[PDB]
Amino acid sequence: YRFRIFRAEKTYAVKAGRWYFEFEAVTAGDMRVGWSRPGCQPDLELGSDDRAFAFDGFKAQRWHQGNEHYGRSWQAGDVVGCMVDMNEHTMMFTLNGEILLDDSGSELAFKDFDVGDGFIPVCS
C-alpha cells in the first residue's frame, strides 16, 4: 500500500605613494574589502557609488558602479592584501599571496581614478 561598514579615520587619507593592508576573514560569507574616499556613505552598498572601489570575494566581483568578474573566491581562514598606488592610480589585490587576475589577464583592479581628497581602507 543590514551590513556593517568599518573604515579608518578620515584624517588618515593618503594622496601619494604606495599603501598596503591586510583583511583576514575566518568566514567565507558576504565580505567586501577595498578603499573608499572620505565621503563614502555608511548605509549604502560598499563600492556601488563613486566614493568607493572595493572587491567582494563571495562572488568574485570587483565593486564599482556595477560589478565585474575578478579573481577567485576565498574560503574560511584566508587573508586578502590590498595594495594601492597613488602615483600610477593602481589597485591590486592578493588572495593568500596570489595576485588576483581579471578576465582580461591583468593583475590590476582599477585604473584612471582621480586622487580627489584621498583614499581610506574600508571593509563591509
From Swiss-Prot:
Highly expressed in heart, lung, cerebellum and brain. Detected at lower levels in adrenal gland, stomach, thymus, esophagus and ovary. It is found in: Sarcoplasmic reticulum membrane. Residues 1-124 form the B30.2/SPRY domain. It comes from the Eukaryota. Channel activity is modulated by phosphorylation. Phosphorylation is increased in failing heart, leading to calcium leaks and increased cytoplasmic Ca(2+) levels. Disruption phenotype: Embryonically lethal. Embryos die at about 10 dpc, due to defects in heart tube development. Cardiac myotubes display enlarged rough endoplasmic reticulum and cytoplasmic vesicles that contain high levels of Ca(2+). The calcium release channel activity resides in the C-terminal region while the remaining part of the protein resides in the cytoplasm. Belongs to the ryanodine receptor (TC 1.A.3.1) family. RYR2 subfamily. Cytosolic calcium-activated calcium channel that mediates the release of Ca(2+) from the sarcoplasmic reticulum into the cytosol and thereby plays a key role in triggering cardiac muscle contraction. Aberrant channel activation can lead to cardiac arrhythmia. In cardiac myocytes, calcium release is triggered by increased Ca(2+) cytosolic levels due to activation of the L-type calcium channel CACNA1C. The calcium channel activity is modulated by formation of heterotetramers with RYR3. Required for cellular calcium ion homeostasis. Required for embryonic heart development. Homotetramer. Can also form heterotetramers with RYR1 and RYR3. Interacts with CALM and S100A1; these interactions regulate channel activity. Identified in a complex composed of RYR2, FKBP1B, PKA catalytic subunit, PRKAR2A, AKAP6, and the protein phosphatases PP2A and PP1. Interacts directly with FKBP1B, PKA, PP1 and PP2A. Interacts with FKBP1A and FKBP1B; these interactions may stabilize the channel in its closed state and prevent Ca(2+) leaks. Interacts with SELENON. Identified in a complex, composed of FSD2, CMYA5 and RYR2. This is Ryanodine receptor 2. The chain holds residues 1062 to 1206 of 4966 of the full protein.
